[PDB]
PDB file of C-alpha atoms and ligand atoms in Angstrom:
ATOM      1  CA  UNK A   1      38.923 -70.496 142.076  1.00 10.02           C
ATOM      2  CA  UNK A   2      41.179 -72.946 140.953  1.00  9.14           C
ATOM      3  CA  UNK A   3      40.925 -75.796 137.534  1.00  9.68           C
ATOM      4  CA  UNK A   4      40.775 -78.417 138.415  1.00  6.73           C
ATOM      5  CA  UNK A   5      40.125 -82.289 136.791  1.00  6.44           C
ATOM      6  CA  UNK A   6      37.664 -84.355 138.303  1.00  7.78           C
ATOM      7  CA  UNK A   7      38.098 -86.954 135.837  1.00  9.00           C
ATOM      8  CA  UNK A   8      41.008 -87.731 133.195  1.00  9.42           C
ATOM      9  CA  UNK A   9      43.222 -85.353 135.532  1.00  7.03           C
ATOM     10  CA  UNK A  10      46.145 -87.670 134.442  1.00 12.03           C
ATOM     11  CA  UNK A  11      47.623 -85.175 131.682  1.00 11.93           C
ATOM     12  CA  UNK A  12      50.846 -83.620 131.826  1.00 12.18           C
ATOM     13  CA  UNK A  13      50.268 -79.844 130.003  1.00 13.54           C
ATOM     14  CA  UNK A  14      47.940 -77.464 128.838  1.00 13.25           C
ATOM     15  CA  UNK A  15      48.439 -75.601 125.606  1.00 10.46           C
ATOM     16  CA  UNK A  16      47.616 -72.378 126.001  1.00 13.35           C
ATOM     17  CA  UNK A  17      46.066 -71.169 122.655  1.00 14.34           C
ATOM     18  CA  UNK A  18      46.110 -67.001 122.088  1.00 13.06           C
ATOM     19  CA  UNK A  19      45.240 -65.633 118.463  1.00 14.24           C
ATOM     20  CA  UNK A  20      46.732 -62.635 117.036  1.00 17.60           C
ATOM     21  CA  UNK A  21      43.618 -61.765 116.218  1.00 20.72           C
ATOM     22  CA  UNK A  22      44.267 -58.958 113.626  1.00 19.94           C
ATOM     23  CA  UNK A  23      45.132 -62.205 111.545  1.00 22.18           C
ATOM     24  CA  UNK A  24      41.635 -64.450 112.825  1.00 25.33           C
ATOM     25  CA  UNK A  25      40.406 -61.655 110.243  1.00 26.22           C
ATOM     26  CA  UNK A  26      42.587 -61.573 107.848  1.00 21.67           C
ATOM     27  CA  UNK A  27      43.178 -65.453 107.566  1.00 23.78           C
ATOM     28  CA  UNK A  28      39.466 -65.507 106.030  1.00 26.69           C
ATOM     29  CA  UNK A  29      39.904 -62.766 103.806  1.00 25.85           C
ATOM     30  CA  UNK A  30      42.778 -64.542 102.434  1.00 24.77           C
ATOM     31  CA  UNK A  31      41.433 -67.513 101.782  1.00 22.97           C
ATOM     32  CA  UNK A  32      38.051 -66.055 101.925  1.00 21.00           C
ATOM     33  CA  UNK A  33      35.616 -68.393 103.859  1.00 22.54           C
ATOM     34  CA  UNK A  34      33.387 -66.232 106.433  1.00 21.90           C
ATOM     35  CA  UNK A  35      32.872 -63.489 108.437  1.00 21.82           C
ATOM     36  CA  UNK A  36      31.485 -63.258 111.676  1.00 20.03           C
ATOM     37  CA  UNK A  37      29.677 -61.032 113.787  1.00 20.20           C
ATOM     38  CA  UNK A  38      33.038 -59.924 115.881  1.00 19.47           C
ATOM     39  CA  UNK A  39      35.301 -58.748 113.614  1.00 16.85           C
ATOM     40  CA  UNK A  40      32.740 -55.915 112.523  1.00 14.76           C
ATOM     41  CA  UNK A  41      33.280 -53.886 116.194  1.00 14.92           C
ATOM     42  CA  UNK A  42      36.570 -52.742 113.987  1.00 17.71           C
ATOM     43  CA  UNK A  43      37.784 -51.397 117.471  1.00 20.34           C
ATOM     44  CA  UNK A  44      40.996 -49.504 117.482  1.00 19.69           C
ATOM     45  CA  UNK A  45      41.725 -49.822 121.161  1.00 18.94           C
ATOM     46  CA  UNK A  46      44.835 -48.044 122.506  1.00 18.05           C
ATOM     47  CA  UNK A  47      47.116 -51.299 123.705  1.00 20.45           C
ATOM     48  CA  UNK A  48      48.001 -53.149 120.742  1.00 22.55           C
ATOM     49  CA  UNK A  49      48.813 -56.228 122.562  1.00 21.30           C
ATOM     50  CA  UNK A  50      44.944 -56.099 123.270  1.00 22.09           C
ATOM     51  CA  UNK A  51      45.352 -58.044 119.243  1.00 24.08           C
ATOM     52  CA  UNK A  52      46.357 -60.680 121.336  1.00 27.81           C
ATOM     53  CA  UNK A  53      43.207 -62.856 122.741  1.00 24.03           C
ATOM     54  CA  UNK A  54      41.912 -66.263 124.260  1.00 22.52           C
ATOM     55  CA  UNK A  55      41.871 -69.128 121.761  1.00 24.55           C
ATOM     56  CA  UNK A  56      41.722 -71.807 124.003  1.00 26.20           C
ATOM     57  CA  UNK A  57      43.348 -73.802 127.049  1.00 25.78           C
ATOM     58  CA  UNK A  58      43.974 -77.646 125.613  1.00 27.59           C
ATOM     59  CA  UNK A  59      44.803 -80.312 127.713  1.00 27.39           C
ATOM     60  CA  UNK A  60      47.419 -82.647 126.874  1.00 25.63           C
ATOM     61  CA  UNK A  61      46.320 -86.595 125.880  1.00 26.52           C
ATOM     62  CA  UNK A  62      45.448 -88.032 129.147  1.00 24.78           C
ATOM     63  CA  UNK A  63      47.569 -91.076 130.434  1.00 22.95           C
ATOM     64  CA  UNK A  64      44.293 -93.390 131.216  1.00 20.38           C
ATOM     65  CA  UNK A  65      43.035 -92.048 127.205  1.00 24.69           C
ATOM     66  CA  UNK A  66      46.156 -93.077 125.844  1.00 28.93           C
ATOM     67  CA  UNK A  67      46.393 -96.439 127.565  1.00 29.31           C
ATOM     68  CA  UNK A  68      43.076 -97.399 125.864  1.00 29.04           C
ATOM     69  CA  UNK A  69      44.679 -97.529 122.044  1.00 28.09           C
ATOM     70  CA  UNK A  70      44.638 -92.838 121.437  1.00 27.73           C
ATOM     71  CA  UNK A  71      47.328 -91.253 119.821  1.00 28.06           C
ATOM     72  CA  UNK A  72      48.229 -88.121 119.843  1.00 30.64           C
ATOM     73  CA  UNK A  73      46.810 -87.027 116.600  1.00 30.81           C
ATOM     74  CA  UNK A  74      43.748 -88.518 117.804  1.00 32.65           C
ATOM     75  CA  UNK A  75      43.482 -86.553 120.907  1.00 33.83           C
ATOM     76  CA  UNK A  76      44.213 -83.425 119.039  1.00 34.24           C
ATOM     77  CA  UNK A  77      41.664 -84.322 116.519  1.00 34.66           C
ATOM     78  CA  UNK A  78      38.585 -85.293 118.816  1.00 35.86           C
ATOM     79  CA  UNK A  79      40.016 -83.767 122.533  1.00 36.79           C
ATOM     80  CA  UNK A  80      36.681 -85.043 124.616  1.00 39.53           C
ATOM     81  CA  UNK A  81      35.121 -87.230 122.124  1.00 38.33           C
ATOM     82  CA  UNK A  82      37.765 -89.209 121.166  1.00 38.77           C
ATOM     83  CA  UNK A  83      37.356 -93.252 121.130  1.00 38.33           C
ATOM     84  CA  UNK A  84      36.504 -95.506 122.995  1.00 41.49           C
ATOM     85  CA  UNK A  85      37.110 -92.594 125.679  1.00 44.36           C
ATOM     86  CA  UNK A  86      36.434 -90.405 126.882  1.00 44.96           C
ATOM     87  CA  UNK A  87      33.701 -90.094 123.839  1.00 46.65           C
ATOM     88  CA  UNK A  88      31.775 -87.162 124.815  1.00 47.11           C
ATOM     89  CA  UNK A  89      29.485 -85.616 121.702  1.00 52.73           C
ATOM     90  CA  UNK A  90      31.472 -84.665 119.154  1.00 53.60           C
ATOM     91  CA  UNK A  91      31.437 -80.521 119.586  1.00 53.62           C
ATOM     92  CA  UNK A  92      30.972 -79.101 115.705  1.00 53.49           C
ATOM     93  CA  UNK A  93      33.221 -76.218 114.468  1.00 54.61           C
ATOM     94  CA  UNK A  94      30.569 -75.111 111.956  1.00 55.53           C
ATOM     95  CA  UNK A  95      27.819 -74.508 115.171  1.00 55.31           C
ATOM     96  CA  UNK A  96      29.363 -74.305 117.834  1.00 50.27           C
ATOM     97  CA  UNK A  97      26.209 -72.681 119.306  1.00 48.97           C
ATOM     98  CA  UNK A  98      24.729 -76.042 119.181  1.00 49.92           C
ATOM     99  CA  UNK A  99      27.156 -77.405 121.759  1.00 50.53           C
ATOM    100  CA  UNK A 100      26.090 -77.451 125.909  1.00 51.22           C
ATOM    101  CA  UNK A 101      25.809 -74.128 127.345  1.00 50.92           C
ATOM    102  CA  UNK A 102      29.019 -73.657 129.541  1.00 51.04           C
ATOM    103  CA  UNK A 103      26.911 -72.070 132.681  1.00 52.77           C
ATOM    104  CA  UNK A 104      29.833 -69.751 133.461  1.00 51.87           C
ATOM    105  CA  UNK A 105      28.925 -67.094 135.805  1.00 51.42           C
ATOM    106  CA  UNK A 106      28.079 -63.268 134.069  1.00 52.06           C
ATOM    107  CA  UNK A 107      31.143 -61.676 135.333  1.00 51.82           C
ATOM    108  CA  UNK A 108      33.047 -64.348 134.145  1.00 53.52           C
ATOM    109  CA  UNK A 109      31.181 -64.168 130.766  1.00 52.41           C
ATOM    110  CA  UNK A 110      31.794 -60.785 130.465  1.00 51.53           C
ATOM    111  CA  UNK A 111      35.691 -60.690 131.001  1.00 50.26           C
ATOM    112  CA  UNK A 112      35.570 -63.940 128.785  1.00 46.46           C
ATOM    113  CA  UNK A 113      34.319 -61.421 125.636  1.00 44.46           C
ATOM    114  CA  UNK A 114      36.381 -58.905 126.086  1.00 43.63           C
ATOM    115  CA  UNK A 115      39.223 -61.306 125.374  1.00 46.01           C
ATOM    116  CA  UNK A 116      37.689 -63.724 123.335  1.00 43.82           C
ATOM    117  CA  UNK A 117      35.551 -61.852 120.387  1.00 43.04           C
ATOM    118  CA  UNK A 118      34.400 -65.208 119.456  1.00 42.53           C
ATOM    119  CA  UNK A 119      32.785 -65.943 122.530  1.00 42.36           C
ATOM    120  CA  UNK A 120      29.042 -65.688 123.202  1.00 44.45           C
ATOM    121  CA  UNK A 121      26.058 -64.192 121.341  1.00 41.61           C
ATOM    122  CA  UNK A 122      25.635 -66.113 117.912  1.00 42.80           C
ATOM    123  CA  UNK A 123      29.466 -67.463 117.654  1.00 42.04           C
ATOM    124  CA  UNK A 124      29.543 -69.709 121.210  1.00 43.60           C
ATOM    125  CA  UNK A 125      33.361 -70.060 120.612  1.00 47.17           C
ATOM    126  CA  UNK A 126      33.484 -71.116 124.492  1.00 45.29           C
ATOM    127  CA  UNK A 127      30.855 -73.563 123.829  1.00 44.52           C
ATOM    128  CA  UNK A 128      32.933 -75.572 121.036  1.00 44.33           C
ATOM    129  CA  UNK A 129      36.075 -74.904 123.428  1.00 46.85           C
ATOM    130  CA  UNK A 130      34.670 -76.435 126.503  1.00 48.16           C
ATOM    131  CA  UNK A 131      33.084 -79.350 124.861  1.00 44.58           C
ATOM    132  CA  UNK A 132      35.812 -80.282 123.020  1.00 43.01           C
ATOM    133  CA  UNK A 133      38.596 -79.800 125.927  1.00 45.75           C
ATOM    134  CA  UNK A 134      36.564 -79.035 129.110  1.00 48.10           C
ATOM    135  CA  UNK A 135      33.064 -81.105 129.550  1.00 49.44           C
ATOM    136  CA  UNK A 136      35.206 -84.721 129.671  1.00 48.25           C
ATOM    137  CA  UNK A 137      37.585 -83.287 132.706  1.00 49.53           C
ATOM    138  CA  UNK A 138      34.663 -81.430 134.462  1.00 48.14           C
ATOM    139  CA  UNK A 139      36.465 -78.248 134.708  1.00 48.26           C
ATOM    140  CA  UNK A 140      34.469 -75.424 136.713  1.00 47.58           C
ATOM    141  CA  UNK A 141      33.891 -73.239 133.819  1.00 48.90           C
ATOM    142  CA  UNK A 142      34.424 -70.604 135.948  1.00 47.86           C
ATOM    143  CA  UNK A 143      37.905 -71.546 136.592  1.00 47.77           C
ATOM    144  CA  UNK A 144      38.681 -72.900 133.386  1.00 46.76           C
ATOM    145  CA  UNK A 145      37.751 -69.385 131.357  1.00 45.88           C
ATOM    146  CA  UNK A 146      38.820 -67.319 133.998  1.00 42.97           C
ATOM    147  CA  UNK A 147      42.135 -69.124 134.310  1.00 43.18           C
ATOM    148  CA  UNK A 148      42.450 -68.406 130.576  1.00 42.40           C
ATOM    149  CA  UNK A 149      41.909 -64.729 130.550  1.00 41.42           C
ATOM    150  CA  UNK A 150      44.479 -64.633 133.515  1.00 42.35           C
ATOM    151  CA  UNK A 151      47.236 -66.248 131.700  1.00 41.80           C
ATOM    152  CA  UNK A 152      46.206 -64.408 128.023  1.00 41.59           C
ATOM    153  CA  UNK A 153      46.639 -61.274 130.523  1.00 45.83           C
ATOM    154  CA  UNK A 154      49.936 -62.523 132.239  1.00 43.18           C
ATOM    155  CA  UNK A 155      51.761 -63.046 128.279  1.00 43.01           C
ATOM    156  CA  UNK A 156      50.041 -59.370 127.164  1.00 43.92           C
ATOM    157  CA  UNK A 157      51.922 -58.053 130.057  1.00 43.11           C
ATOM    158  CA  UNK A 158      55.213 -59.731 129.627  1.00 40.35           C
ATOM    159  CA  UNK A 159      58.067 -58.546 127.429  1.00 37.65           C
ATOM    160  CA  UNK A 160      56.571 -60.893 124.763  1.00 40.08           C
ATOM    161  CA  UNK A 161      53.368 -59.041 124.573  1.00 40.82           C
ATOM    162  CA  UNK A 162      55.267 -55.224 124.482  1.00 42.78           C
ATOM    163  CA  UNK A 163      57.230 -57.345 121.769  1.00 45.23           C
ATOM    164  CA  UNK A 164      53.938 -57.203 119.586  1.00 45.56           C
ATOM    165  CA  UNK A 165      52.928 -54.386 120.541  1.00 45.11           C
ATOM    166  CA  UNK A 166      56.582 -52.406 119.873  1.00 47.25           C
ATOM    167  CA  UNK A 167      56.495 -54.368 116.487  1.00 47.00           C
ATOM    168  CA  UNK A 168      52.993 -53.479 115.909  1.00 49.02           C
ATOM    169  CA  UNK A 169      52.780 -53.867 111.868  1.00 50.51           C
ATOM    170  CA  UNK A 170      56.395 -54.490 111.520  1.00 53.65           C
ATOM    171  CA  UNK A 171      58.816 -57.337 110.341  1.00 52.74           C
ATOM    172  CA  UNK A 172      60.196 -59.312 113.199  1.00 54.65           C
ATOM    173  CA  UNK A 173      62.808 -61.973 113.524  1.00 53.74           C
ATOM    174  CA  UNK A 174      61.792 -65.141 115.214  1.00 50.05           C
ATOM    175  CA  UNK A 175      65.748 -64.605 117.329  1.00 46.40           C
ATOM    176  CA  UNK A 176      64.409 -61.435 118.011  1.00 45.18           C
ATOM    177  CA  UNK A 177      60.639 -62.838 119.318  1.00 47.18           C
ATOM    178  CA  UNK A 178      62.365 -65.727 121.255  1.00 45.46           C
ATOM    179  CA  UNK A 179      64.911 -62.888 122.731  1.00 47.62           C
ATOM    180  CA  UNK A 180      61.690 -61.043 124.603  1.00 46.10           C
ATOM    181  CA  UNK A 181      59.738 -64.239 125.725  1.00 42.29           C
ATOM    182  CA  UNK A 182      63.252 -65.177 127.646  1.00 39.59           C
ATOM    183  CA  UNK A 183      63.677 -61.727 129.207  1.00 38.94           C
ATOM    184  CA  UNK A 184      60.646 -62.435 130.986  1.00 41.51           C
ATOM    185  CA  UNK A 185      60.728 -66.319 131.175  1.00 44.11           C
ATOM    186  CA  UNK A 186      64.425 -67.593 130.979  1.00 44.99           C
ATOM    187  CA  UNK A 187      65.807 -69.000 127.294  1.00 41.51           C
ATOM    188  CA  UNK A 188      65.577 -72.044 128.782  1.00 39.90           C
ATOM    189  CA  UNK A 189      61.461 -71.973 127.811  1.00 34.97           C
ATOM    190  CA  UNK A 190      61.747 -70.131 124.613  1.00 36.80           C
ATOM    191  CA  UNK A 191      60.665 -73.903 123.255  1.00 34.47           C
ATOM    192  CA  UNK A 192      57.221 -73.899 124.749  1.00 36.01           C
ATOM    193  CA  UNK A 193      55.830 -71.438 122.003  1.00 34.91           C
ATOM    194  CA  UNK A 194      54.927 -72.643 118.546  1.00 35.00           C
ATOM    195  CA  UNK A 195      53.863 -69.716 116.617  1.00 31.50           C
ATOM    196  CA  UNK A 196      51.338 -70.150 113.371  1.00 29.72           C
ATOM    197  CA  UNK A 197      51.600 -67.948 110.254  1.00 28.13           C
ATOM    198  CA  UNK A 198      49.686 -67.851 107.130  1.00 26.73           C
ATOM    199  CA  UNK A 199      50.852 -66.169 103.924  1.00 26.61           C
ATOM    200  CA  UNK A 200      53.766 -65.562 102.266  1.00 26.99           C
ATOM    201  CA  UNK A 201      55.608 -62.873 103.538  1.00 29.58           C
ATOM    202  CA  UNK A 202      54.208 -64.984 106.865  1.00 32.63           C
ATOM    203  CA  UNK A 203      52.101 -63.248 108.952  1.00 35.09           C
ATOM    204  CA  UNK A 204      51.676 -63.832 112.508  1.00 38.33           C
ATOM    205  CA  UNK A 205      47.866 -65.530 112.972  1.00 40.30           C
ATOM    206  CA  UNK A 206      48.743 -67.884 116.504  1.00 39.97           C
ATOM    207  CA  UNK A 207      50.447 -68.231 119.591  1.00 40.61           C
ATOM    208  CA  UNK A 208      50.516 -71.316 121.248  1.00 41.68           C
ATOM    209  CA  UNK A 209      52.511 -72.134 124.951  1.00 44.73           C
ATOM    210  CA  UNK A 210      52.847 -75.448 126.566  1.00 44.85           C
ATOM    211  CA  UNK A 211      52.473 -75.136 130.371  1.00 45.29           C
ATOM    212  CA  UNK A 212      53.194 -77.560 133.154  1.00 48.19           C
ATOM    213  CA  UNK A 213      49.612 -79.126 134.475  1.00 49.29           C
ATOM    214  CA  UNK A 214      51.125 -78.492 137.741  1.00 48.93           C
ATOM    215  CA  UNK A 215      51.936 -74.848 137.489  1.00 48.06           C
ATOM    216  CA  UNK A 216      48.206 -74.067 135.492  1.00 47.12           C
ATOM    217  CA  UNK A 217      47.050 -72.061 138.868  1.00 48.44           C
ATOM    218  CA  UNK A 218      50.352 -70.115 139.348  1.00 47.92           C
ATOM    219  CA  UNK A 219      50.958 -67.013 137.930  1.00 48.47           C
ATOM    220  CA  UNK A 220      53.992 -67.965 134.965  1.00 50.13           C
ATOM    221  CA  UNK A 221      57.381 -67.910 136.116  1.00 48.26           C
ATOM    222  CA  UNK A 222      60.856 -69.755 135.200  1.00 49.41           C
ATOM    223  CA  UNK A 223      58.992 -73.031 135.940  1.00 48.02           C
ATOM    224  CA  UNK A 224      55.787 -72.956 134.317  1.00 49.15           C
ATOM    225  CA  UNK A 225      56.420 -74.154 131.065  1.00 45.24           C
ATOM    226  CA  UNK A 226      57.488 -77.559 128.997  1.00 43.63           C
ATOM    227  CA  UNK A 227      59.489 -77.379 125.824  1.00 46.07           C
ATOM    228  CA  UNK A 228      57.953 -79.056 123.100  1.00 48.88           C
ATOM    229  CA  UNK A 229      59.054 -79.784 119.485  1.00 49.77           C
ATOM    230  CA  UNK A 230      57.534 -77.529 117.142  1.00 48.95           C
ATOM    231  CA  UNK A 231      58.680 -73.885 116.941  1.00 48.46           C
ATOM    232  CA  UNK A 232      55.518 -73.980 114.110  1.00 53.14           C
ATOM    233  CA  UNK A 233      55.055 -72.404 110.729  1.00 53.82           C
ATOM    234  CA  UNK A 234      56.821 -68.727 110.543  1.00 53.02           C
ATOM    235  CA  UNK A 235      60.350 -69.424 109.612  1.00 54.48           C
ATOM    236  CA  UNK A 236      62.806 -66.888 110.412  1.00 51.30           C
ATOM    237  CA  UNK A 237      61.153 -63.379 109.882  1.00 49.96           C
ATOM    238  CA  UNK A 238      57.125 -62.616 109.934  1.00 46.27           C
ATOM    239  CA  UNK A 239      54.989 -59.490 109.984  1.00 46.88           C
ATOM    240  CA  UNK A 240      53.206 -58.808 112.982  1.00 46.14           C
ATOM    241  CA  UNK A 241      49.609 -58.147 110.956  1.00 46.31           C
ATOM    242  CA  UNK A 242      47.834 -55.110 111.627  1.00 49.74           C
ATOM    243  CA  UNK A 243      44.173 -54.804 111.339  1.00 49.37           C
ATOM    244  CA  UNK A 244      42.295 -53.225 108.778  1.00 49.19           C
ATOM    245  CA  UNK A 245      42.134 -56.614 106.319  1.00 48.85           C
TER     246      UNK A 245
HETATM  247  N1  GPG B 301      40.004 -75.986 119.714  1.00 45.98           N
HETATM  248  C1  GPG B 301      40.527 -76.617 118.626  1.00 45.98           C
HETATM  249  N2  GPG B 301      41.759 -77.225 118.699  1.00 45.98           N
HETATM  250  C2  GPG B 301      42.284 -77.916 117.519  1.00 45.98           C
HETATM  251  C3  GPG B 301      41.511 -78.026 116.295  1.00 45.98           C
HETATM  252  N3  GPG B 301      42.283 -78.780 115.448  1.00 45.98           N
HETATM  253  C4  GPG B 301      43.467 -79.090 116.116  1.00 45.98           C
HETATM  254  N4  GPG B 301      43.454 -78.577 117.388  1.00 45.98           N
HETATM  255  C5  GPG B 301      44.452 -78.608 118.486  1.00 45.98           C
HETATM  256  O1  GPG B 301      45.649 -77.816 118.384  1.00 45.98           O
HETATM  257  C6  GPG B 301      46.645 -78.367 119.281  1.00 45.98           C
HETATM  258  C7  GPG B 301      48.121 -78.080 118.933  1.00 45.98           C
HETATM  259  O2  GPG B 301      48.141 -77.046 117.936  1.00 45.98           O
HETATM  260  P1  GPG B 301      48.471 -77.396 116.386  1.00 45.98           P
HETATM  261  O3  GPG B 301      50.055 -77.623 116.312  1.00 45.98           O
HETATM  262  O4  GPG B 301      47.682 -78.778 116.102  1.00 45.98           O
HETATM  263  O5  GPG B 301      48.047 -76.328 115.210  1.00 45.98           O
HETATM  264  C8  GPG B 301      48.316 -76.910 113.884  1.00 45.98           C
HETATM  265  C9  GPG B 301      49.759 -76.926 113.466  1.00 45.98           C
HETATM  266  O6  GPG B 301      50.008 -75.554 113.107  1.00 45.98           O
HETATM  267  C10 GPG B 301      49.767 -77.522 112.103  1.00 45.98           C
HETATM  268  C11 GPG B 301      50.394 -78.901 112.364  1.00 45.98           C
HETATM  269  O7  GPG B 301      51.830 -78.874 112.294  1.00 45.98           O
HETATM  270  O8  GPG B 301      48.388 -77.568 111.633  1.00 45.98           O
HETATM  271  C12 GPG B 301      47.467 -77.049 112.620  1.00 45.98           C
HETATM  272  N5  GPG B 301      45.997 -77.370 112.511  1.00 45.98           N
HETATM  273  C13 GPG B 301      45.041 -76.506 112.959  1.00 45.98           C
HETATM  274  N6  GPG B 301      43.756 -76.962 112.797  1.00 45.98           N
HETATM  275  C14 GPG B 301      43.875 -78.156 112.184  1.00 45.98           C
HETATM  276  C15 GPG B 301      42.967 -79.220 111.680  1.00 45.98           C
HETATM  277  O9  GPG B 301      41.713 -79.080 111.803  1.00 45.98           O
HETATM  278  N7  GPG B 301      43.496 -80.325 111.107  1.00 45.98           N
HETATM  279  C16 GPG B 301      44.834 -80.524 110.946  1.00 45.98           C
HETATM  280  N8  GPG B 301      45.198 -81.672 110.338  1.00 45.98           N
HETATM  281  N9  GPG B 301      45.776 -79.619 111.350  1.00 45.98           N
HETATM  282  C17 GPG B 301      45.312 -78.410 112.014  1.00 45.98           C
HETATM  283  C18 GPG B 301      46.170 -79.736 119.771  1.00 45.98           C
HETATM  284  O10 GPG B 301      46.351 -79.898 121.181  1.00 45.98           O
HETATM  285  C19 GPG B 301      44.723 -79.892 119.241  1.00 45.98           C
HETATM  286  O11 GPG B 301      43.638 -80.033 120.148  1.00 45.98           O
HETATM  287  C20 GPG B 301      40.178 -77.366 116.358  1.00 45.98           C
HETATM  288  O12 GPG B 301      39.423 -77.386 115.347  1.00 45.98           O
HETATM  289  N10 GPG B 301      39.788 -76.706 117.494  1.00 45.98           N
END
């Protein structure tokens, strides 16, 4: 079915949020925080671009949350429970198993983990996720998750997903990246995609595209997307990490 806002609908964008996930590994063995209960399945699959999963699906600062005195960074920092509004609970990256229960469907909680290692069992990444950028809009979780997966699946099956997986451990220009996501989506929206490294050499950890509120229930095409003004943190050449950190 299709997302959408009951309340706070008055954003412009969504940021899709995709993790290259061989690097949501790595990152904590680099600066070596935690583990988790995900990372351990160790799965060598067959499609690389399978690396690539759901992080997240962020709305943009609502017009009627901004009017009230939120900024951007505030929005980013607090998404549902920022002040005075919309102020849900504050959702807690540490236990994110203590947040609401999403009451997604089992099909849709199944696809949902097979993209998103993260979610479910004793992580509840999709718990965190929806309370922090789902509960105040009153998404259908349903929609909201399975909208995700659809667009994760829609950039794995692009020329910017056979990009990562053709460059599958290798060294990669960011001309070169930006070259594939416009053979499938116009140069015009190369912009939309910030890309987050860590390291130096930088390695390739996220993938974030802006997306028109409008267009969220489309499949992507030439019109889908909003430029925005951060290409991110990679510079001019990265690694595409492999696993085995
Ligand atoms: N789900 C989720 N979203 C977050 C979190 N922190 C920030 N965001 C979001 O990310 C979005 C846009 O992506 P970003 O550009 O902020 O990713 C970041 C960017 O690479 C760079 C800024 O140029 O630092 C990063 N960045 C990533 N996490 C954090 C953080 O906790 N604090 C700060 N200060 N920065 C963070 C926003 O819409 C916002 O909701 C979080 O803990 N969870």
């Amino acid at each position: 079915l299709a997302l959408q806002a009951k309340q706070y609908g008055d954003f412009d964008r969504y940021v899709l949020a995709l993790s290259w996930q061989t690097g949501f590994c790595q990152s904590q063995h680099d600066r070596n925080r935690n583990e988790r209960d995900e990372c351990r399945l160790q799965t060598e699959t067959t499609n690389k671009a399978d690396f690539l999963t759901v992080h997240g699906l962020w709305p943009g600062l609502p017009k009627s949350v901004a009017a009230r005195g939120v900024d951007e960074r505030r929005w980013m920092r607090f998404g549902c429970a920022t002040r005075p509004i919309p102020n849900l609970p504050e959702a807690r990256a540490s236990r994110m198993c203590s947040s609401p229960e999403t009451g997604l469907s089992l099909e849709t909680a199944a696809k949902l983990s097979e993209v998103m290692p993260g979610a479910g069992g004793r992580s509840c990444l999709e718990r965190y996720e929806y309370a922090k950028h789902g509960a105040c809009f009153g998404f259908d979780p349903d929609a909201y998750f399975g909208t995700m997966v659809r667009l994760n699946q829609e950039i794995k099956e692009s020329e910017a997903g056979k990009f990562l997986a053709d460059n599958y451990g290798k060294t990669v220009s960011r001309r070169d990246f930006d070259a594939a996501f416009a053979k499938s989506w116009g140069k015009e929206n190369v912009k939309a995609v910030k890309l987050t490294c860590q390291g130096n050499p930088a390695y390739l950890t996220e993938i974030q595209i802006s997306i028109k509120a409008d267009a969220i229930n489309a499949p992507l095409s030439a019109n889908s997307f909003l430029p925005q003004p951060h290409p991110g943190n990679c510079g001019k050449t990265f690694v595409i990490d492999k696993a085995g950190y």
